[PDB]
Amino acid sequence: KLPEAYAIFDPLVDVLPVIPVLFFALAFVVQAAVGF
Amino acid sequence: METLKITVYIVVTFFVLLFVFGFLSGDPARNPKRK
Amino acid sequence: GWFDILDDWLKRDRFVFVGWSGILLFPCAYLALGGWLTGTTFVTSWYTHGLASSYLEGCNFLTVAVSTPANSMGHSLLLLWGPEAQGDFTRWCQLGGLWTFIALHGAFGLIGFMLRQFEIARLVGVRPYNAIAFSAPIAVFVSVFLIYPLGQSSWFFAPSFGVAAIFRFLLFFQGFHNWTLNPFHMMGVAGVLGGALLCAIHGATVENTLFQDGEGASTFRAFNPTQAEETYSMVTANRFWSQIFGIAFSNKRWLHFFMLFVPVTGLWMSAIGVVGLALNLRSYDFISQEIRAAEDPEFETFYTKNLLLNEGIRAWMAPQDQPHENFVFPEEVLPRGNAL
Amino acid sequence: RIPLWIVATVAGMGVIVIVGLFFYGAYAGLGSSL
Amino acid sequence: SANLWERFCNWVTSTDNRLYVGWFGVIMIPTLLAATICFVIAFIAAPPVDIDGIREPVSGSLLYGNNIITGAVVPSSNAIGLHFYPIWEAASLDEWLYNGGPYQLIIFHFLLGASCYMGRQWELSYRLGMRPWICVAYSAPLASAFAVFLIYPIGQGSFSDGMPLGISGTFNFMIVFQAEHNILMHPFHQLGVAGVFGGALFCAMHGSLVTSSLIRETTETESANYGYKFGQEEETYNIVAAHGYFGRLIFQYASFNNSRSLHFFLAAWRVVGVWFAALGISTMAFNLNGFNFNHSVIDAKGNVINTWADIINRANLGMEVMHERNAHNFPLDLA
Amino acid sequence: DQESSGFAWWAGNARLINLSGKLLGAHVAHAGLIVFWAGAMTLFELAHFIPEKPMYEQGLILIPHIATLGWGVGPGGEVVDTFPFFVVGVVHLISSAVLGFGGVYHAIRGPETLEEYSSFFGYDWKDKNKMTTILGFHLIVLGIGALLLVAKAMFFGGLYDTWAPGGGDVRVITNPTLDPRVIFGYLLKSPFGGEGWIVSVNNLEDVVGGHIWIGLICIAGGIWHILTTPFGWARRAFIWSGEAYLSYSLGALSMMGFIATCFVWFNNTVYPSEFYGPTGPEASQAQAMTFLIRDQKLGANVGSAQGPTGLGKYLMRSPTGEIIFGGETMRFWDFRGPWLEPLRGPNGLDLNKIKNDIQPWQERRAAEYMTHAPLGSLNSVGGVATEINSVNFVSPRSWLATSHFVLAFFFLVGHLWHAGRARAAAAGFEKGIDRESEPVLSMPSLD
Amino acid sequence: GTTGERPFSDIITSVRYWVIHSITIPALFIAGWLFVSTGLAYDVFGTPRPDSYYAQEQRSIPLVTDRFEAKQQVETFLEQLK
Amino acid sequence: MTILFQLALAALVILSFVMVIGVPVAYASPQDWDRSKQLIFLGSGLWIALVLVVGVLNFFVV
Amino acid sequence: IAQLTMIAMIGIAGPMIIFLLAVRRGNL
Ligand SMILES: CCCCCCCCCCCCCCCCCC(=O)OC[C@H](CO[C@@H]1O[C@H](CO[C@H]2O[C@H](CO)[C@H](O)[C@H](O)[C@H]2O)[C@H](O)[C@H](O)[C@H]1O)OC(=O)CCCCCCCCCCCCCCCCC
Ligand code: CLA
Ligand code: CLA
Ligand code: CLA
Ligand code: CLA
Ligand code: CLA
Ligand SMILES: C=Cc1c(C)c2cc3nc(c4c5[nH]c(cc6nc(cc1[nH]2)C(C)=C6CC)c(C)c5C(=O)[C@@H]4C(=O)OC)[C@@H](CCC(=O)OC/C=C(\C)CCC[C@H](C)CCC[C@@H](C)CCCC(C)C)[C@@H]3C
Ligand SMILES: CCCCCCCCCCCCCCCC(=O)O[C@H](COC(=O)CCCCCCCCCCCC)CO[C@@H]1O[C@@H](CO)[C@H](O)[C@H](O)[C@@H]1O
Ligand SMILES: CC1=C(/C=C/C(C)=C/C=C\C(C)=C\C=C/C=C(C)/C=C/C=C(C)/C=C/C2=C(C)CCCC2(C)C)C(C)(C)CCC1
Ligand SMILES: CC1=C(/C=C/C(C)=C/C=C\C(C)=C\C=C/C=C(C)/C=C/C=C(C)/C=C/C2=C(C)CCCC2(C)C)C(C)(C)CCC1
Ligand SMILES: CC1=C(\C=C/C(C)=C/C=C\C(C)=C\C=C\C=C(C)\C=C\C=C(C)\C=C\C2=C(C)CCCC2(C)C)C(C)(C)CCC1
Ligand SMILES: [Br-]
Ligand SMILES: [Br-]
Ligand SMILES: [Fe+2]
């Protein structure tokens, strides 16, 4: 149901929102690279 | 019954005021010392 | 002294200490934790409870388990070479074999492990209060996995290794046993609650008593490990409760031995009551009540309310729960409120 | 010598990714509702 | 010189008095007492109460239900649901009685007051230099009780389904729950057990080990619990002497080295999940119930292959049907 | 260079004393993140909403909001064009850029101090006015939005009104309610069952005509905090720590999540049942309503139909002496809505209107809200706790109620957290007590 | 105090590890996955193919009747479904 | 112009997946903070545009 | 068929923005 011309894109947008969880989840990747 | 109502409210009030008015003056200092 | 040669190796401070206990503790404590997982993910109980166990069947983590054997079995320990499977892993697998298994190995693992405390604390040199504290648990397991079954009908009716599996066990008891009304269990509760209350009253009673004997704004660097003496002033904290909740401690020596009692204690309580359920010898009715209820359609107490639940959580259950006693339950017969 | 950090991120995906297959197989698996 | 109020305000905050009467206390005590003495009496002689709407009073009590496990303080009646039933409404105290009136008055009190204890549980955390987060470990407590006295009610229609105060009423209240919300099939209720079933497991340890490691101060002449005269800044028990054991039980790195990172963990386990539970109930008071796997697992043709949790369904459907019999005239319980 | 000088790790975050442009671009960081979800998930719903199928049978909560204003409305509530939805969705994902982009700026290359460099965009927590100033400012920024609606209901496309004359249909509010009492009244009373603090909003003007009263209040507030330094009493109390400020403005939200979770759980208007779900109570009434109807048709007399409890099979009196559905549904007699009101009278339900005025449509609406009730399962399975696996919807109203609570809850314990420790900074207990002068060691020990 | 501790606290970073283990992990993963993908699993524990629970028809459940000859039952109860 | 469109945003697609990776390093890496800081305004010009390109472009769908 | 590719890409993106930042060294 993504306006026609953008159908080619639902494939991605479908995984769009699930970013935010990743962000606190990221602030962790770094911290280990810095050994806390 | 109704007569009791107010008696009850008054009390409630009399206190909160004691709670609020009370917690106000002489508080952020209410401890052993400020360092 | 070859005896000391073996000994010698054994109890040698490896990374994860082995020990004499190790020859009992470790194996059983393996095929058990193991066996569970093995059947949890591969074996079906469909021939004992006609229900799905393993993850293979489609079952969910929660809905999985190594279901006790069919009651048709009894208490026969279903040996692999037991006349039951006659010696045949595949079948012995189907006849539930893993149960007596998991249970018994875990039995000896729990033994081997309590001995796993007595060993260490005796080498390292300390009061046997850890291992002693393990009584609480050997009881609980022993009461609810061997004695219970044994004094009842089959190995069947015993708990079944899984989540939803034991969750059942629970409702089961609330139903035909009305466990929740037992003096004992109402103490187990006492233990498992307070013990937790303590575990925290004291826990955070600590984190908020100690001193500034480190620099930063974090307590992790704070003195230790065993050097300077005491982090929390048991006096400054004392007057905190003796003025809030009225009464506080004194002597961390007991506060550390009353923390042991509470749970290990109450937990043992229930374990007794539970033996009582073996012989169905439970706390279900309050005579003084049923009699005063009988002749008076106008007397209702929660007790009665609860009591009606049971019939419900029983009539509907039992049949599809106790397959071996071919329950035949007409639609009428089945009790149930008005409109529901 | 592999960065002790990357040892922890590549793996923390192993569970993070496998449990993701797990969580899918619950929407079409043998243990589906269909 | 300070006038008379400036005194009052010192008396109430005086770090001296036998039991601190902190400001919060000024609303805690008056409240707490109201409740208690009320409850304490209506637990004795409690006229027949009629919880559920239907006029069929179910009064467990003593001067009626002559027992301790039986009796309890019965809830409010659907009739006047989530509605505030102020004793001064009942055109007759006898009316305020039929309709569970005593319940509320007590509950709202013990509720708000406990909130007051919650607060005045930190008033010393400040009035006496020390870390404030003691009162915070009391969050897990309060909240919960709140979840089982206020949340569920607001959630559903009226207080009528709000943890009746009395031994057996608990159970009723509980069993109902388990039958309307698969609350035993919750990854939340898990977390109450998870921790509670932990604190019990851990209280046994720190209590264990600690006692398991005590110097040597009497030699069974009298007891060993004297190895500590109160106040001493020493630590009757040996830390590393202690860890040496648990580190030796389960491989090292697994046993606690730092003592402060220990004791904390003890509020960590309980409070963390006891909160969750508190949320769980508070969550379902809006109907986001435990897992539903009824039938889930299927067959090829389509036969229904039973999930353990399917059984759980009957022991549920069972209680489901019988609960509040003759109190609803339709087929769906939406509360 | 931190962790040694900075206090802890997990708590590593929080560095900031007088100023810091890093935490600056950190709130201007995260606060961008939020904008991202706004647009991210939006584009995730329009990318789903079936042509026409109950806006709630699909996991939609963002869309259901955008709707209430009147974007894609439809006489009845049926989406008319899946376009307005998209407009915001992207205007956000794109918006996530600006509010995001420079977020990562002040955060790594941004100038630390706000004093060395700039001097107006540099604060200091102990600075009483700087703080008291910025306040009214963002206050002003709220008084602005606080007026969009005013202008969204009065000018750019009124709100969707589920209380319209013929049925749900986005009308445009022209008579906002500007009667200081009725509007200032709501908050001023009604706490429990009778009605709700503010959860009880009959008409959509009491809201628009009210949001107006607020868009001013907070606005005339900037012109006050901006324009003014603390008064004379509040100096005392209200400890002025940086951390504390976190709590001060924190435990507010906790109160809001609650006063929030409630709105979705109960409110019929600002939360149209047509976009979200059927409010719990609305569900229970749907039940009786249905079987009252199913039955009257079979030839029964609800008017006189005697209950089994002996109370009233379909109807009974209320403590107010009014008529209300019976059985258990009595628990929800206070509930109101457009599909029942007309089938209502001067003393509660009207035996007349209830016998024939029972117009056809209501029976079905009254049905939908029965089948679809605010009850479900974690793993989304609609139906009472023990229903087979088939329908799988879980109400939005159920989802927003739960969610927020968990959050607004924790927050309350989060406000305790800081507001209690920050009371130890301006006191110095924060870090424990002093191994030599423990304040209880110099007190006449009660015994 | 005393610790006969072996490497560990680093052996994951071990250069040879993530090598002779970039072969052992997946070689173990699929090893089992086959124990599954084959259908062996079943035949191992006897677990039923989702088609072999109830015979194509009859609606009973192969509940183990007796105790001493259990297997035999299972035997005929197995061939059953056909 | 249905065609040329798809690429107008499929342009602002790979631009920003790149902007996400770039911008950061430019404020953290010593590898010249100024050459990267300037190439920074590169995509931030296409960004502003490329979307605006999909801008008035978006109206010409089917 | 499966954008399982996109999610993993977006994934590997930022956890390896740090890699490059650590292999190029850059005050993280
Ligand atoms: C008078 C003295 C009493 C003192 C109390 C002492 C205890 C205090 C302890 C905590 C503080 C509690 C303060 C009041 C709590 C109110 C709870 C409640 O049930 O409030 C009642 C109201 C009622 O809302 C509903 O409002 C409805 C209105 O909508 C209805 O009518 C509308 C208008 O027609 C529409 O038609 C709509 O469609 C229809 O559904 C109905 O009137 C319902 O009958 C009514 O229940 O709800 C709401 O106010 C919710 C929003 C505001 C209230 C607070 C929000 C949440 C608070 C929870 C905090 C406790 C959590 C525990 C703490 C954990 C650790 C500390
Ligand atoms: C007096 C000058 C001033 C003004 C006018 C503002 C205004 C604002 N600040 Mg702010 N701030 C200031 C000084 C000021 N600040 C100082 C001195 C500091 C410390 C040095 C800060 C630190 C700070 C932080 C950490 C944050 C803010 C945020 C905000 C925004 C709040 C978002 C909101 O209200 O919801 C929006 C709802 C509305 C109804 C807004 C109405 C539209 C208005 C703003 C028109 C603006 C036109 C233009 C900006 C286009 C839109 C702007 C964009 C924000 C949408 C708002 C634009 C928040 C933010 O949004 O930034 C990421 C935020 O997190 N400020
Ligand atoms: C919360 C609101 C807020 C506040 C109070 C500030 C405050 C500040 N920012 Mg800033 N910033 C914000 C939000 C905010 N920012 C957001 C949301 C972003 C990313 C979108 C940025 C990105 C950013 C950068 C890259 C820089 C700053 C700078 C600054 C400092 C001086 C520049 C400045 O503020 O110009 C005051 C603002 C105005 C006078 C408004 C002018 C608006 C005109 C019409 C257009 C501005 C240029 C625009 C056309 C082109 C944008 C590109 C830009 C990055 C150069 C000052 C402390 C630094 C600075 O420039 O200091 C000299 C600096 O290098 N900010
Ligand atoms: C092993 C099985 C098992 C276990 C371990 C538990 C464990 C628990 N269940 Mg549970 N449950 C089970 C099976 C189990 N359940 C089954 C089979 C059912 C089906 C009915 C239930 C149904 C059920 C319900 C409905 C509820 C629970 C709740 C709980 C939790 C209550 C304890 C708590 O959270 O404290 C929190 C409570 C407090 C901290 C009390 C607050 C403190 C007040 C102020 C005490 C007042 C003291 C008093 C005034 C004394 C005054 C002075 C005095 C000192 C003299 C606990 C985690 C409760 C829950 O999780 O919510 C919190 C709950 O509501 N269960
Ligand atoms: C809601 C608004 C809010 C804001 C702005 C803050 C801000 C802050 N809090 Mg905080 N807090 C809040 C709500 C808030 N809190 C609530 C509701 C609670 C519980 C009631 C807490 C409990 C709390 C504690 C105990 C501490 C803080 C601390 C802090 C400060 C350090 C920042 C920090 O550590 O994050 C940066 C990153 C983290 C904190 C890690 C977050 C991710 C965790 C570790 C999850 C780990 C993943 C893993 C699966 C966890 C398993 C579950 C298990 C942890 C239970 C910072 C000022 C610390 C402090 O004192 O300094 C101010 C501190 O020690 N907070
Ligand atoms: C998402 C919420 C959030 C935000 C806004 C911040 C913000 C901040 N944290 Mg922080 N933190 C967080 C969560 C957060 N944290 C959590 C959950 C933890 C627990 C692990 C921590 C633990 C922590 C510690 C120990 C420290 C900080 C510090 C900081 C500050 C310095 C950041 C820095 O030095 O990184 C450097 C940046 C890098 C090494 C590269 C990061 C890549 C960028 C930032 C991400 C790009 C975003 C996106 C993918 C790209 C957008 C594309 C766009 C350009 C178009 C900054 C204010 C430092 C500080 O001094 O404050 C106390 C500090 O010492 N944090
Ligand atoms: C909530 C249930 C519960 C569990 C999960 C549990 C678990 C554990 N308790 C231990 C210890 C203790 N528990 C103690 C008191 C208590 N423990 C309690 C309740 C539990 N204790 C209760 C609350 C009391 C407190 C009142 C004492 C103090 C100790 C010990 O000091 C000891 C410890 O030091 O822990 C760190 C650990 C000893 C490990 C071991 O014996 O290995 C050996 C046994 C093995 C490996 C085989 C398992 C044996 C069992 C019989 C087999 C069952 C396998 C399946 C049933 C798996 C179940 C999973 C499915 C059913 C879903 C272990 C982690
Ligand atoms: C962040 C961490 C913090 C700590 C708290 C985390 C708590 C998480 C609890 C989750 C546990 C279960 C996860 C469910 C996922 C799922 O569903 O996987 C299931 C098996 O699970 C499992 O196999 C659970 C694995 C647990 C076994 C561990 C026991 C001890 C062995 C460890 C020794 C290691 C040396 C199988 O899924 C099934 O998949 C299909 C069957 O193949 C079905 O169709 C269904 O989809 C069904 O769900
Ligand atoms: C700093 C920091 C951080 C962070 C921060 C922040 C602030 C965040 C975030 C984030 C953000 C804030 C972001 C953002 C953004 C994004 C963007 C900017 C993008 C983009 C995208 C886009 C643009 C797209 C989309 C689309 C379009 C375009 C349209 C439609 C289609 C599609 C969907 C494709 C971290 C984590 C590192 C930690 C540390 C600190
Ligand atoms: C209603 C309405 C509206 C609006 C409203 C409003 C706007 C209002 C308001 C308001 C309000 C309602 C407000 C508020 C609040 C306030 C508060 C909340 C406060 C407070 C504070 C406090 C309480 C405090 C503090 C303290 C204390 C506590 C004591 C002592 C100490 C101190 C001082 C610190 C509208 C129409 C739009 C919508 C709907 C309706
Ligand atoms: C059987 C048997 C045996 C043995 C055994 C065994 C060896 C067992 C085992 C075993 C095992 C060894 C199993 C296992 C396992 C495991 C698993 C399958 C796992 C897992 C899982 C999990 C669990 C994961 C993950 C996670 C995460 C990461 C998150 C949360 C937590 C958890 C952990 C869940 C023998 C031959 C002697 C005899 C016959 C029988
Ligand atoms: Br009942
Ligand atoms: Br009903
Ligand atoms: Fe201790």
Tab-separated table of N, CA and C in Angstrom, chain H residues 8-58:
chain	number	residue	atom	x	y	z
H	8	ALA	N	16.118	9.535	-9.009
H	8	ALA	CA	16.235	10.823	-8.330
H	8	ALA	C	16.310	10.654	-6.806
H	9	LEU	N	15.602	9.648	-6.288
H	9	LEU	CA	15.591	9.364	-4.854
H	9	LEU	C	16.515	8.187	-4.614
H	10	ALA	N	16.582	7.274	-5.580
H	10	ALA	CA	17.480	6.142	-5.459
H	10	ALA	C	18.857	6.766	-5.517
H	11	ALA	N	18.861	8.090	-5.488
H	11	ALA	CA	20.073	8.883	-5.508
H	11	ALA	C	20.262	9.357	-4.081
H	12	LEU	N	19.171	9.844	-3.490
H	12	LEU	CA	19.204	10.313	-2.114
H	12	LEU	C	19.197	9.091	-1.210
H	13	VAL	N	19.233	7.908	-1.822
H	13	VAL	CA	19.272	6.664	-1.066
H	13	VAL	C	20.721	6.349	-0.710
H	14	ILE	N	21.541	6.164	-1.736
H	14	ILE	CA	22.945	5.856	-1.556
H	14	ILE	C	23.736	7.058	-1.085
H	15	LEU	N	23.164	8.247	-1.219
H	15	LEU	CA	23.857	9.448	-0.770
H	15	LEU	C	23.985	9.428	0.751
H	16	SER	N	22.837	9.312	1.423
H	16	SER	CA	22.735	9.299	2.887
H	16	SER	C	23.242	8.040	3.604
H	17	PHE	N	23.167	6.875	2.958
H	17	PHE	CA	23.707	5.644	3.548
H	17	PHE	C	25.207	5.936	3.642
H	18	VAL	N	25.671	6.816	2.752
H	18	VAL	CA	27.069	7.243	2.690
H	18	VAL	C	27.287	8.389	3.683
H	19	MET	N	26.343	9.328	3.736
H	19	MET	CA	26.424	10.467	4.654
H	19	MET	C	26.496	9.963	6.079
H	20	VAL	N	25.804	8.855	6.332
H	20	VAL	CA	25.753	8.241	7.652
H	20	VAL	C	27.124	7.757	8.061
H	21	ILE	N	27.845	7.209	7.089
H	21	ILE	CA	29.187	6.681	7.315
H	21	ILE	C	30.247	7.807	7.355
H	22	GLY	N	30.087	8.800	6.481
H	22	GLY	CA	31.036	9.897	6.415
H	22	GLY	C	31.011	10.830	7.605
H	23	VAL	N	30.146	11.849	7.543
H	23	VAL	CA	29.993	12.872	8.590
H	23	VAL	C	30.648	12.484	9.915
H	24	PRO	N	30.316	11.293	10.456
H	24	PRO	CA	30.932	10.885	11.720
H	24	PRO	C	32.460	10.985	11.709
H	25	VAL	N	33.110	10.106	10.958
H	25	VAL	CA	34.570	10.089	10.874
H	25	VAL	C	35.197	11.490	10.786
H	26	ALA	N	34.540	12.392	10.055
H	26	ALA	CA	35.015	13.763	9.849
H	26	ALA	C	35.174	14.594	11.122
H	27	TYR	N	34.521	14.174	12.199
H	27	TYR	CA	34.621	14.897	13.463
H	27	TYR	C	35.450	14.090	14.465
H	28	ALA	N	35.766	12.850	14.102
H	28	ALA	CA	36.510	11.971	14.992
H	28	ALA	C	37.908	11.619	14.531
H	29	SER	N	38.061	11.365	13.233
H	29	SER	CA	39.356	10.967	12.675
H	29	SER	C	40.369	12.091	12.449
H	30	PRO	N	41.647	11.845	12.811
H	30	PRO	CA	42.727	12.826	12.645
H	30	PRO	C	43.071	13.006	11.170
H	31	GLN	N	42.707	12.012	10.357
H	31	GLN	CA	42.967	12.048	8.925
H	31	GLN	C	42.339	13.319	8.381
H	32	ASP	N	43.029	14.435	8.599
H	32	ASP	CA	42.584	15.745	8.143
H	32	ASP	C	41.094	15.964	8.378
H	33	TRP	N	40.784	16.803	9.355
H	33	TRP	CA	39.402	17.113	9.682
H	33	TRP	C	38.817	18.162	8.741
H	34	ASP	N	39.682	18.873	8.015
H	34	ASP	CA	39.254	19.939	7.095
H	34	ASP	C	38.940	19.575	5.635
H	35	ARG	N	39.626	18.584	5.076
H	35	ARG	CA	39.328	18.190	3.706
H	35	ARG	C	38.005	17.422	3.718
H	36	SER	N	37.829	16.594	4.752
H	36	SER	CA	36.626	15.781	4.917
H	36	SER	C	35.492	16.701	5.338
H	37	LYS	N	35.814	17.697	6.164
H	37	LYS	CA	34.831	18.670	6.644
H	37	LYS	C	34.222	19.458	5.482
H	38	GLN	N	35.005	19.650	4.425
H	38	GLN	CA	34.507	20.376	3.270
H	38	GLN	C	33.753	19.437	2.331
H	39	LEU	N	34.314	18.263	2.035
H	39	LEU	CA	33.593	17.321	1.185
H	39	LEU	C	32.268	17.067	1.889
H	40	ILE	N	32.211	17.426	3.172
H	40	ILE	CA	30.994	17.256	3.958
H	40	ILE	C	29.882	18.072	3.303
H	41	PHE	N	30.122	19.349	3.024
H	41	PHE	CA	29.066	20.124	2.398
H	41	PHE	C	28.707	19.530	1.029
H	42	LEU	N	29.460	18.535	0.562
H	42	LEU	CA	29.171	17.921	-0.738
H	42	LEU	C	27.758	17.351	-0.765
H	43	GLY	N	27.559	16.204	-0.121
H	43	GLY	CA	26.244	15.581	-0.095
H	43	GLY	C	25.156	16.391	0.600
H	44	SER	N	25.561	17.322	1.463
H	44	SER	CA	24.617	18.172	2.195
H	44	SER	C	24.076	19.248	1.281
H	45	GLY	N	24.464	19.160	0.014
H	45	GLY	CA	24.010	20.102	-0.985
H	45	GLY	C	23.132	19.265	-1.879
H	46	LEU	N	23.551	18.022	-2.088
H	46	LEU	CA	22.775	17.102	-2.896
H	46	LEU	C	21.631	16.653	-2.021
H	47	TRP	N	21.913	16.502	-0.734
H	47	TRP	CA	20.896	16.086	0.206
H	47	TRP	C	19.722	17.061	0.094
H	48	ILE	N	19.967	18.329	0.432
H	48	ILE	CA	18.945	19.378	0.365
H	48	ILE	C	18.233	19.347	-0.972
H	49	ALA	N	19.001	19.118	-2.029
H	49	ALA	CA	18.456	19.097	-3.373
H	49	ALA	C	17.816	17.768	-3.727
H	50	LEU	N	18.642	16.731	-3.782
H	50	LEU	CA	18.195	15.387	-4.110
H	50	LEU	C	16.813	15.026	-3.564
H	51	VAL	N	16.470	15.518	-2.374
H	51	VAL	CA	15.152	15.225	-1.813
H	51	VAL	C	14.176	16.141	-2.538
H	52	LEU	N	14.538	17.417	-2.620
H	52	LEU	CA	13.729	18.410	-3.296
H	52	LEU	C	13.586	18.015	-4.746
H	53	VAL	N	14.538	17.229	-5.227
H	53	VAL	CA	14.496	16.736	-6.596
H	53	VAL	C	13.335	15.743	-6.637
H	54	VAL	N	13.283	14.871	-5.622
H	54	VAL	CA	12.221	13.875	-5.476
H	54	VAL	C	11.050	14.748	-5.093
H	55	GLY	N	11.412	15.987	-4.777
H	55	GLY	CA	10.468	17.002	-4.389
H	55	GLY	C	9.346	17.088	-5.384
H	56	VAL	N	9.388	18.156	-6.167
H	56	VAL	CA	8.381	18.402	-7.180
H	56	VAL	C	8.280	17.179	-8.118
H	57	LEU	N	9.242	16.265	-8.022
H	57	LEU	CA	9.230	15.075	-8.858
H	57	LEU	C	8.132	14.122	-8.403
H	58	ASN	N	8.022	13.959	-7.086
H	58	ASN	CA	7.031	13.076	-6.459
H	58	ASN	C	5.599	13.211	-6.973
